[PDB]
Amino acid sequence: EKDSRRRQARLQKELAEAAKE
Amino acid sequence: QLLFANFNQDNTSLAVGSKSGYKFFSLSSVDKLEQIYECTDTEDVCIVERLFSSSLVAIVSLKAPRKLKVCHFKKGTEICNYSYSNTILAVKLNRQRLIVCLEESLYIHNIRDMKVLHTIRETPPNPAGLCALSINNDNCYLAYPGSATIGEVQVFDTINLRAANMIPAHDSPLAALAFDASGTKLATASEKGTVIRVFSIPEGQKLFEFRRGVKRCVSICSLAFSMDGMFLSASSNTETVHIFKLETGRAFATVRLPFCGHKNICSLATIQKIPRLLVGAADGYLYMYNLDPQEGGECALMKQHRLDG
Structure with missing residues (x-):
């Protein structure tokens, strides 16, 4: 749904x- | 209060989990156990695994024993979580991989995005969560029991996601496993606890065989290499810790604990230029002993600190 796009980025x-480290 | 105590990958941090949360202690001095972090927002913390001295920590709580939480502990944020079909028995991590051990399966995650890269299914039952993960990126091996009745070790390449070897280590089932810092040596012990063996990785050749002074049988609960790989400690449910020196059969040094029967975790750490044996015990203390790397013998107690701070 391309909401996966920005959440994966974050x-x-x-x-x-x-x-x- | 306390449920968990363990050292990070290079012995720079001590984690103590309790019913009210968890704490990190630095291990850079001797006079005081210096608290560097405390969390009180998560109850009944049964696993706390830090990534070296970074801000990344993996947490499991008794309130949700099938759920792994990955957090930025200094910021106090949950980054992501993952739930498994059964309770989490162990979590191991290095700079490239995070491994979750269930009784019957192992999950290999990419630690850069937390995606599952590979699932090892239908392992021999592993109720103790016995496994070991190399801290070295070039020799990135996972070791876990290949049998629940015989002391066989499965060695698995977590970068290429393929088996590398199966090592018949002991006749009785495994009790403890530890990689050296290079990832090229694996120390092993069985439920009999009478022999500690070291094998090359991945080739599986027996390199060392150490006897714990023989005698009776113990329940070995902790194996640990020094960072330079020259020393290997073995602790148990008895009062004696053995330290072996990997020079070209018996203990090089020993320490006598003030108790007999508590579970404990050991590590070999150099603090202020002096090699030390650190023992985190279920009686609620951290004990620090001085090791003479040239002479050996019985090691003297330098300090003991309350694990609760």
């Missing part, structure tokens, strides 16, 4: 941000 950004 997901990947948030996981990368959290994993930053």
